Amino acid sequence: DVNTLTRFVMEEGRKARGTGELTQLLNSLCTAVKAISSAVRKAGIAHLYGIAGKKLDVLSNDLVMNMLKSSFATCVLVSEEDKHAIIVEPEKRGKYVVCFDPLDGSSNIDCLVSVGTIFGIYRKKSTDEPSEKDALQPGRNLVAAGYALYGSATMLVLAMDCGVNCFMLDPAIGEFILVDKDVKIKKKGKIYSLNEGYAKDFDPAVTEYIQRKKFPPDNSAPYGARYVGSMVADVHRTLVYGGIFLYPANKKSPNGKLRLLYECNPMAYVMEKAGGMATTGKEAVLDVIPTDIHQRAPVILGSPDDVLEFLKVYEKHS
Amino acid sequence: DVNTLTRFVMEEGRKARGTGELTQLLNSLCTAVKAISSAVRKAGIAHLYGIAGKLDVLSNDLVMNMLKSSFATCVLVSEEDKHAIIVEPEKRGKYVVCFDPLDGSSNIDCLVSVGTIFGIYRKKSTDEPSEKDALQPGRNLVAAGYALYGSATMLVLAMDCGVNCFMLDPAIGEFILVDKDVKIKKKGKIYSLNEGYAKDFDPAVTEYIQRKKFPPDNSAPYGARYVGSMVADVHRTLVYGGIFLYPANKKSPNGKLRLLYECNPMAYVMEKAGGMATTGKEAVLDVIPTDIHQRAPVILGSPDDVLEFLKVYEKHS
Amino acid sequence: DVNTLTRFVMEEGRKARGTGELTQLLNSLCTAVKAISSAVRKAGIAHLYGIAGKLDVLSNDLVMNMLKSSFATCVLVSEEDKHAIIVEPEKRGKYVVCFDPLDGSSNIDCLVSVGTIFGIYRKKSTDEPSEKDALQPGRNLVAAGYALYGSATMLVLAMDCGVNCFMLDPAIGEFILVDKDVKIKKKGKIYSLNEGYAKDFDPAVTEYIQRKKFPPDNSAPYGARYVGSMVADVHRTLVYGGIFLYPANKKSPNGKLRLLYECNPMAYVMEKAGGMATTGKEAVLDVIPTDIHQRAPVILGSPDDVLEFLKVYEKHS
Amino acid sequence: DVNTLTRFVMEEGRKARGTGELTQLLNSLCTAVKAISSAVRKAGIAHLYGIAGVKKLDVLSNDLVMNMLKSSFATCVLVSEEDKHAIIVEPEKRGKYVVCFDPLDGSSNIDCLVSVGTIFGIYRKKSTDEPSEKDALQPGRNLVAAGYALYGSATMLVLAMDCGVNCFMLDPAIGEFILVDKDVKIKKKGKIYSLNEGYAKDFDPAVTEYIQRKKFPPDNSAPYGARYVGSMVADVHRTLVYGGIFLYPANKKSPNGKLRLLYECNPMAYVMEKAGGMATTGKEAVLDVIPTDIHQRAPVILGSPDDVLEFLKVYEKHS
Ligand SMILES: COCCc1sc(S(=O)(=O)NC(=O)Nc2cc(Br)cc(NC(N)=O)n2)cc1C
Ligand SMILES: COCCc1sc(S(=O)(=O)NC(=O)Nc2cc(Br)cc(NC(N)=O)n2)cc1C
Ligand SMILES: COCCc1sc(S(=O)(=O)NC(=O)Nc2cc(Br)cc(NC(N)=O)n2)cc1C
Ligand SMILES: COCCc1sc(S(=O)(=O)NC(=O)Nc2cc(Br)cc(NC(N)=O)n2)cc1C
User: Fold this and answer.
1) Which pairing describes strands D94-105 and D75-80: parallel, antiparallel, or unpaired?
2) Which residues bind Mg(2+) 2 (chain D) (predicted)?
3) Structural domain containing residue C52
């Protein structure tokens, strides 16, 4: 039977017999993603170039913010684009806290590289007046998370307790079609992904691990290398093909570069629901308790055999 | 004034006072590229999954049929076809087209950027058309370019008048001129290659990449990017500057990329943009091919970066 | 605040504290409507004409499959099917849907506006659904409406809460709420019927039309419009006011339009918008059908106009 | 073999050995029609209604056609339904052609989503004097090309030239007009008549009798059907496809009709004649009227030749 994102979420909600707020939230986010996809693919660019005589990251943030505010399902919104948490006005408050990066990778969008939207959804835990503190939950508390990848096609990957499911946007009809059900990552991959241009700054553990991938001590084939430079594209390839993605700490950047709340945690959650792993080196990404909504974290994620091998090398230098 | 691909090509053809065959060819290829973009973005995928109860093959069929029906071509070389295609006599025109209809599609399962690459020659011999008419050096190209199906769809077209970039507006199905007479940066800050083959690299490549990560002059190290899809990696090189490398390795002792419909079209765009493209021993555009699917090593990009690599290459004889 | 069809229906369903079946039904229909619109605007026609080397049947297949797979329906009545379709047991829900998947398609050769019409009932039986579950008067309708594939695509949905109009934004494939709680004008200035059959008219219809062209009180004559596509003519009546007629005559004592999936949904829309819909003898919604494909005369639109017609009909006993 | 509008126009142009100006004109107009279609179908309307937290369609359509024609370098004088005076193209952008157009015909009722359309007629400038409004005052017989785009259930472009009438369907998935009906001809006699019968009190007596003959034929044959969309492009395209007759005739209140000669009547009369139909004012061929004002009106009766001839017989009976 054909299935769509909306119909899929509704069916899961009916099984759980929830109130419907989470379904309204996801439907609103789905509408925002279709509008971002349309803008990213440059619909209407002819009018900007004068056929008849707002930047993408700003527009993307406005779409997600406005669709989430008007869903009546959220109370606190944390965005990569905003210094402070946004508190939904009282008449529109619902029960969820949403952390998101509305257009990840957009710094290099001038070269038409894949870009994406990342989101993580938490339940507000206290009855206190909503505030920035409500977003300071460990990733283990996520109720749902995922990403939209605007690549050669647009796909939404949605992770929940029931697993990870992948939906392809059919732009002819504006519907997300379920195309990959209950996806699991390979136990061990053949690709490693990181910015090797910064090798002079590498932690000694990262240097040794990468050397073993290129010069295996036994007779296995060296791994292939890929680094798009857009987190959503690199993580999605890691999910589909297996392997390992690294944005690790070094001494210049002792906490890494990627943001914990709206980059690392949603991707770590997708990975764990697909049977993968996600570590800071010292602990699971999902176990870090944040103290700042924009705090950074190191991240190494992907196939479990590859992540465990990195942790072996990391321990060796600890 | 706004400009479109069709109107741009027509105006250039009128200036040159040609017969119109090349304009008909390019218009036909433009139509194929829009149809490929629609399929790559998965229009109609709901019907395949039962709402009412392969991509590289379709892409090849689109380009082949639109080029045959243009009446402008006589010999067609495709990555997808083992032999050159000889256009039937009643549809024959004067141009030879070499193309890769969906480059990078081996990894399309992860939604990586993919693209279409093409190079167009005037048939040079007066012999009956045959595979030999496609064996010209890239220096003989009349036009070349690529369509990138990335976050948006863009067509990059290089001719004697330079390199011009057109964005497909999917609301109206028109390629809009957005970047005119493009030139590559003299020196970039990104290097692009699959370092997974480090064990197989020749010493010149090894030393060069070492210089990018550990500069002797205490300058900042280069960043690394490698999409694994040639059109995406080359387009970033064009837009941002830098260097792209696919050297020979043990699996690929003559290189991996195809000379006729990957290396030559990209080298032509690079040189018309003021960049460089070398095999290490000679300019890519100067290689005389003997086989339509033959491979070549390639290093291309900003001139100062390619010149620095050639300096290291000279050092190792 | 912006609103969409899906979010609007979900909010109304949550207010009503229903089980969710009707919302799933409407979402599935909305997907079918978007797929029908795409085909009607001829997306992909280049492939039918050979770029790489039925419509009413497809429309019926889209509606049937999306409704079957919604798990919300048990009996489906379509203009396209001689007998009611009984949903297989594991996919059964509690609702009966009567629909015309592509009304007006006989003249789609001239690109006239076409549409989809639907009416939704709760089933009457407590087990063993059958065609009898579709033989309900229109008064039993829970929801009804139509999609108009006109210059743009619009979905009009009528429920107890009133009538709401949603424009399909094809750039994002979303139905946007653009007209809330619509009410028809009390009196219009347009009448709509096929005057080519004037020879067969009931004397009452003859007199009423004469009053529109030669008003007795020196008011302005009405304008005439007749698209010949019921959804287009009824939507114009809703938006502008006025009156639409497909009346009974001696050759066709029960009219031409079908009661279950043309007259009843349009009459329900009209009544929820403050209009009227009559057969001449009784309200359309009060007719108890005995056959799923039975015909009915229909006169609908602005209340002052329908009441003026009924006054003339009364005079002719 | 598949054919597109661009490939069709180029091929006809190559045969004629022209300079390419008309092809550039038609391609620019084709781009304009695609952008009008996108706007008419409401692409982007979600932004107007606040999805992220601006100009009327007839104004936008005029701006699109005007800007694309000016930038084609193929035109010198432009007449639009929307502008009181002819637009004279600035000297560095001038070409040899005169274009008359209605950028969005029928938009008065676009609130109810009725079919709308774009109508155009193309003339060669005839005099060697500085271009002016007078260059647009040519009879329709001087037309080089004319046609219309119908934004109906699908978008179709009908293009008439010396070689006949050809119909192209816009495939919105790829933004290309695909040739779907070649060298179209209208039926010799139809079964549908089309006019606003609500104004019957004001009819000319000849029109009253003709419509009387359609509903109550003297030989007891079957009556004609009636259709009137109220959008000229929709009603005329139906007349072309199904045959029959379309009337917007003169009366005493409107002795010159209501439709505009230069950018409604003449282009449609030209399409009809190239398809083997007829188009008359009652007194003369529409294409033979020599205009004196760019916005002058003309009565028009057009369609299947046998139906128009029967109208003319009734019209002659009433002198
Ligand atoms: C960790 O959560 C994952 C699972 C969940 S729970 C929710 S929900 O939004 O909280 N509840 C919800 O949609 N309920 C719903 C919707 C409709 Br329509 C009908 C009925 N019927 C009834 N209640 O009898 N119920 C969504 C998802 C995906
Ligand atoms: C290496 O070439 C780069 C430049 C060229 S040359 C050609 S072409 O196809 O050979 N000639 C061509 O389009 N002619 C053309 C087209 C049109 Br419309 C009108 C007229 N007018 C006339 N002939 O008076 N001529 C295309 C391009 C881009
Ligand atoms: C004349 O129509 C009356 C209006 C109605 S009633 C229905 S419905 O489908 O029967 N019920 C329904 O959607 N319930 C729903 C949906 C979601 Br999400 C969450 C919850 N929560 C919970 N149950 O706690 N409930 C749809 C419409 C438009
Ligand atoms: C009024 O119907 C007459 C038919 C006509 S004439 C024109 S045109 O624009 O005047 N000439 C034109 O397109 N020439 C053209 C274009 C291209 Br490409 C190549 C060559 N070749 C060459 N010149 O050798 N020529 C268009 C149409 C449809």
Assistant:
1) parallel
2) 81, 102, 105, 264
3) 1-181
Read off the tokens for B161: 């008048």
Strands D155-161 and B223-224: what pairing? unpaired
B58 plus B159 within the same structural domain: yes
Q: Which residue of C has its CA nearest to D52?
A: C2
CB contact under 8 A, A172 and C38: yes
* β-sheet bridge partners, residue C177: C166
Tell me the residue ranges of DSSP E strands in chain A: 74-79, 86-87, 93-104, 115-123, 142-150, 154-160, 163-170, 175-180, 191-193, 224-225, 244-247, 277-279, 299-302
Contact C23, C7 (CB under 8 A): no
Q: What is the rounded CA–CA span in Å between residue B141 and residue D143?
A: 42
Residues from chain B that touch D175, judged by Cβ atoms under 8 A, are 34, 170, 172-174
Which pair of structure tokens corresponds to residue D153? 């259930």
Q: Which secondary structure element, helix H or strand E, spans residue B121, and what is its range?
A: strand B114-122
| B31: its two tokens | 């139509």
Domain end point (choices C155, C181, C207): C181
The residue written with tokens 């029967």 in the block is D310
Question: Does residue B14 line the site of ligand 2, with CB under 6 A?
Answer: yes
User: Domains in chain B: how many in total?
Assistant: 2
Structure-determination technique: X-ray
Are B200 and B161 found together in one domain? no
- What resolution in angstroms, rounded to 1 decimal? 1.9
CA distance C5 to C23: 10
Beta bridge partners of D20: none
Please list every residue in chain C whose beta carbon sits closer than 8 Å to the beta carbon of residue A170: 173
Choose which residue among C19, C22, C30 to substitute to test ligand 1 binding: the one with the highest number of ligand atoms within 8 A of its C-beta. Answer: C19
Of B2, B66, B171, the CB nearest to D43: B171
What DSSP character marks residue A81? T
Q: Is residue A284 lining ligand 1, measured as CB closer than 6 Å? A: no
Q: Please, are residues B131 and B171 in contact by the beta-carbon 8 Å criterion?
A: no
Specify whether C194 is located in the same domain as C80. Answer: no
